[PDB]
Paper text:
KtrAB is a cation channel with a nucleotide-dependent RCK domain. The structure of the KtrAB complex revealed a homodimeric membrane protein (KtrB) assembled with a cytosolic RCK octameric ring, formed by the KtrA protein. KtrA binds nucleotides, ATP or ADP. ATP binding induces the adoption of a square-conformation by the octameric ring and increased K+ flux activity through KtrAB; ADP binding results in a non-square conformation and decreased flux.
A simple indicator of ring conformation is the pair of distances (L1 and L2) separating the Cα of N38 residues located in opposite subunits across a ring face. Like in the wild-type protein, the ADP-bound R16K (at 3.0 Å resolution) and R16A (at 3.7 Å resolution) rings adopt a non-square conformation. However, the ADP-bound ring conformations are different from each other and from the wild-type, with L1/L2 distances for the wild-type of 40.7/30.7 Å and for R16K of 52.0/21.9 Å. In the ADP-bound R16A mutant there are eight KtrA dimers present in the asymmetric unit, corresponding to two different rings with L1/L2 distances of 34/30 Å and 37/28 Å.
Numbering used by the authors:
A (entry chain E), B (entry chain F), C (entry chain A), D (entry chain B), E (entry chain G), F (entry chain H), ...: 6 to 222
The structure:
């Protein structure tokens, strides 16, 4: 199929490897810590102990063959950078690297990392958003101004109909889904009822959704 | 306004604190490492050096007053657990804790954490999804089976109309938005055109979306 | 049989282990400090060097088999707590833990310690009672108001009879025992004599006993 | 009234100071740790930050005036010893010192401590006694053979009368008190009932009390 | 004249700054360690305490104005790299950086350092050359095979003439200079004499010079 | 051949060892840091982990046999000094030591170091000279005033003859060599041509060479 | 012969052990630092690694057998004291202990040390005496008034005879020895000569010797 | 009078300063530890806090004026060495330095210390001498082989005459003095009696004196 190499079996890298393996892709789990290799042996096609900063070991892995290599080392800046550089000189098509801080991001950028990810920082922003607003369970930003939001229904919304809560005209937003006791309603008709503590999926402008949260719920 | 306490200024905690501070909330950044306290001094209301496992220090912080306390320590399990337990005993309303593994999740659960977050595991699943399918930019899971997906349009989709790509009947999914050159089209009509390299927002069953990805694009 | 495990060979734990061993019970003395293990090797059935916060070591001890486990670590709160949690998850019937302060007591309480002991605090109250009243050698409180007290006889009590010192009617208290030159008299008859420097065991109300001490001796 | 000096506000010293202050005695709480002084300022007449090993500070406290000085430092042997020596040379009438081990006890003995206390060791013996016999809540030893014991009543004792349980004749021991739901009965008459889970106060020979526990409850 | 910025007043950087200042150039000596700034205050035009990794401080220095900026930080890789990057984004014409190891050299190379110097490594090669051959005081390599060498004259060369030591025909090398007691003779005539302990400057092939060293001196 | 001992595998020492090994000399690489020993194992005859300040280890190395011992420790003054002294008492013929500062130089001098080297300071002077004058590729100073300089030819020198550029009479300097495309011309005749970007080797007075650089190129 | 135990191989203890071993006595060198044990292995009968504060180790050494035990630990007061006490309870005949300060001296005294030595303080007094008076090289006091003094001969004494310097009649003192260029003359005859810079050994009254120093030399 | 500088108020240095001050000499007590300066303030002319390794502080002390400077730092080799070097370059007439080990002695020697003292080692030799022989009270070594010894007389010597104990012919040694009940006899005649427990002063060869101790007493 496609070939993925995950170097550094941290929580993030480990998750990548485990999930990718669940999808049934060829995943090479590389790790200098023996116990990590032993841990993810069940969760990979091939799990190898290797020092990814050592070039001959990287050649012994045959890493050139892989379409995607992911450097999930985000504590040891030197190791991460060095590995990324090695892979770049080894002409890897796609090099995705976990970064720790803005400047490690910078050096990764300059040595030509293809995609740089800050999992903790991002997820942190998300959890902070959920923290300031207990009503937002999840969301996705379509753009700087437009977004789809998942909301936890309050008492103000109990036994209310979609036609009763006219979001399409009053707030310019559109409701997409209602999740009640695990049961799910996609693109629901105006007659449908929303009961409290249910999942509500609205779509529109950020400020408009905020407005609806304010006066509506 | 609201009062937030962020204990452990890692990348995740640090991000929470920084972002929350950008929102203009009262954020107490707590950290046993002095340099971390000095680092996020600009991005908090009050930045304090404290051993969160040492309780008298926790009383010296006056943490009982806070509505939300975030334990963003995810490497030192013992520290995290001890701190969370301490906060629970101090009758803190909302305790959100970062977990490292399933078992740390378990002990947090049993000592009554209010919300447990796995930033790296989740983000890992997301990036893995993006890895197996270069065409998925982002997504949100409504449930175990149902999801809203953001797609990168290929050449197979160029100059194709929404009525041409009948997703609502052929695949049971519904298109929600089209992003073309930064311009944005919300809940578009069947006459609208999709050009390649544009953002496409589909909604439906996971397997169905996969189907459409397979035969459609 | 019943097997007792004493983790932490301090003065308190060490005393427990030594005394229990003198009683002829099967006692496992656990200690991360080698010299402590070597110290109490003579006073236990099995003395083992182990890190009780490390789960695999706790399994290597086979601690699950034990009816009673005593955590006598009272300086290192973190260690104590982690250990107690470990034992609880390992379904130990009776977990008795030494505590340092009110809140360490609390955290032990929430993670389900079966009995929490404050040796220094208690003993402190007792010695303080002995300090404010030079006459009291020892005592036991039956309740908030009622108590049995051991008293050191002064010259005021020399050659005095029980009927002479009518405590049962004049002070509402009752004399229980007289210890003279090591010889012992239990529940003595009214004809019996009390000589100075002897042990006197009175029983009654605290304030009443104080009265008898005041006007009597 | 009387003047007490408590040096070292640990759990033991702290307890002494707090309790003595509750009795309304003049207690000087001395401590090199500022936070401890701040902690027990409410529970002493004068709470001072001082290094008790430094002689000029000890004169600055005016410790010569005190009838009783208590050295409650039991971890730092050198500090305890040095302090005790200082107090001895300053002709203090009564010097009571907390000890850690047998040899610290020895050096305290040799430099002329007036009373040496091992709170943890003693309390440890007591709790161990309570461990080998679940029925004993508390006790006091009148001598090597004779003792007064507090017992937790089992189902075997429920709804039983004092005359029914003839301890004075069958076992040579005498019942002193019965505590039922917090209510208290001192030196109860033979008609009185003992209900389960109540506190029972027996007095007699150790082996005899053991006998009564064996066949009786 | 020209404007030089020396960041990091180590031995190497300090030497650069001092020497440059002796030549009468405008040299800005920058250093986060105050005592270093105080040390080279006499040997610079402007000596400033600054964190060169902090951008606003770098603007406060007005570093954009300088033609040459020298990063003489070679122990703290992160600091060096970071500074170099900052300078690069600020469009500095010439950035010369001291490197520690091959990989620090690599990252400097990739973030676009203009000249990278390894003082210890080079000087090391030179001193090693002097070690294997006690006769060489100094030298310069014209190419892989051809070189000009400074030699310490031995007794075999004492009172010997240039025509006596026919290097131009016997060894294919040419003598360039003779230094006697500080006095100096450039391109000396064949009648000229060489005395021991004098500086002799020969020019030719490496192996040929070695030959002359072998049989000649 | 000859035997060299390199103690302290820094950049300087490491360079010495590597270069000497390239020359094919017997080099003992000594280092207290295991990873350094492992690093230069390929670049030495024998690479040993040793604390050079410990005498018995120094005898275990058999360092007395070596003609040359190099102390390349330049951060840890005490280590360097102690080691050098050790070697001196062991009657080592030649002890060359890396120095950090003027006073470390002094103590090395007083304990009888045979040659003391300051690589960073020297090389620093050189780089400073190259900094104030961008034109010089390399050089060697014969004395305070007289020098041989290697110059990079500009367009002003293209297609010019040696007789055309009369340096011997107009500037009192003499051209020694011309390097064109790797090809090399030693002591060239006046008919020879200099093409731009070639290496030019001039010899004479510093100020005179400066003059020639100014008006000539 | 006799058996000596030297605990603590410092400079003082080490000197004791080495010297005693040179005399050919059975010396047990005990030390918790392995390297010290390895150091004095050549200079003892048996050199053992042991923690002298640990009683079971002290029994493992078989220290009860020894006539003399020397505690040469003078930095670690607690170790010294604890050890000394240990030896005392083990009924050691002679316990000689090195002391640090007056109070450590006190506690050693009180726990029954047989001889307490202050090497640095004493030797300090001596060197101070030599400092205030350059003429005295060494001396021994026979009593408060009478003494034997070693003097450095000055120029006033050069080429002078014993009969010339009539000390027995003019100064009431008697010359005992003359040391010239290492050669030694015991109880020299009146014809004997004193040369400058030689060692002169006078005997008599202190004030008389001072007198001779004044008027004679 | 004369001016002494004592740098480093240890036990040895402190002793020097105190004793010298008792003699009434001008003593400058220098110490980087403030508490030491405060301790010996009563026992010096001027007691100053100074870092003796810092040259400007040494000039601030005005140390050039002093005839004698004593470096009594014997734990911190670097401090001692650096200071000694500083004093030497400042041309102090007499520099006496305390040494720790043979190599520190060496570096002191090489940087030109005037007198080097090993108090612990020496005093150690003395105490060892007293240990192997309980009879020797004091002594002075004239040379490696020759010595004057003070001896405690045993019962073997009681009521014995000098002519009876013919040491001058039988052992080649000479008796110099007899101290009886505080009374003193200098250079006693052969008729004089020696009684036990008296001080006996013999002079001669070491082995010979040992011989006399063996067969005589
Ligand atoms: N030089 C290297 N070569 C190969 N793997 C490395 C190297 N350095 C680090 N790693 C890998 O990184 C992993 C540790 O990552 P971790 O420290 O857990 O990240 P985080 O601290 O962000 O959780 C280890 O399993 C190790 O295999
Ligand atoms: N017991 C504790 N008390 C207070 N702060 C702590 C404690 N343990 C860890 N921390 C803080 O947590 C931070 C480390 O978080 P980090 O390990 O970076 O999270 P992650 O591994 O998810 O990136 C440190 O800055 C440290 O100060
Ligand atoms: N993580 C741990 N695992 C095992 N034992 C521990 C741990 N932490 C502490 N201990 C035990 O506690 C013992 C000492 O307790 P101590 O500090 O003396 O209590 P206190 O200070 O109250 O006297 C040590 O000997 C050690 O074995
Ligand atoms: N030199 C000293 N002078 C005054 N107080 C001291 C000194 N040394 C220790 N202490 C006191 O001892 C107390 C700590 O005792 P602690 O270590 O808790 O005993 P334990 O560990 O046996 O419970 C501190 O409050 C401190 O003030
Ligand atoms: N970010 C920075 N900004 C300014 N100066 C710095 C920075 N980082 C390091 N320095 C300076 O560099 C110097 C250290 O250089 P050094 O480590 O001695 O080089 P080397 O190890 O090559 O001798 C310090 O004096 C410090 O002031
Ligand atoms: N006691 C010692 N014995 C032997 N080698 C030592 C000792 N102390 C330091 N070294 C050597 O010094 C080297 C480190 O020098 P380094 O700190 O890199 O100097 P700098 O910091 O000036 O570059 C190490 O390779 C180590 O082997
Ligand atoms: N309890 C102990 N048992 C055995 N050896 C000890 C003990 N305590 C200290 N020592 C030894 O004493 C030596 C240290 O003496 P040191 O501190 O150098 O004396 P000083 O400070 O007077 O020079 C060490 O080698 C150590 O091994
Ligand atoms: N560089 C220095 N300048 C001034 N005083 C110093 C310096 N280094 C050490 N000292 C002083 O020397 C004293 C330590 O002597 P110490 O180590 O007790 O000698 P010893 O080890 O022989 O007992 C300390 O009081 C300290 O203040």
């Amino acid at each position: 199929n496609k070939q993925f190499a995950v170097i550094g079996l941290g929580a993030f890298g480990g998750s990548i490897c485990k999930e990718l393996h669940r999808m049934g892709h060829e995943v090479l789990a590389v790790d200098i810590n023996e116990e990590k290799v032993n841990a993810y042996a069940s969760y990979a096609t091939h799990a190898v102990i290797a020092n990814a900063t050592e070039e001959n070991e990287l050649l012994s892995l045959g890493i050139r063959n892989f379409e995607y290599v992911i450097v999930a080392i985000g504590a040891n800046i030197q190791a991460s950078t060095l590995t990324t550089l090695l892979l770049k000189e080894l002409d890897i098509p796609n090099i995705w690297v976990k970064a720790q801080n803005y400047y490690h991001h910078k050096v990764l950028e300059k040595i030509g990392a293809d995609r740089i990810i800050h999992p903790e920082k991002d997820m942190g922003v998300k959890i902070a958003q959920s923290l300031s607003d207990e009503n937002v369970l999840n969301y996705i930003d379509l753009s700087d101004e437009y977004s789809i939001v998942e909301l936890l229904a309050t008492r103000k919304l109990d036994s209310k109909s979609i036609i009763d809560l006219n979001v399409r005209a009053k707030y310019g937003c559109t409701i997409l889904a209602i999740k009640h006791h695990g049961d799910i309603c996609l693109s629901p008709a105006p007659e449908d009822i929303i009961r409290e503590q249910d999942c509500l999926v609205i779509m529109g402008h950020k400020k408009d959704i905020k407005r609806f949260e304010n006066e509506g719920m």
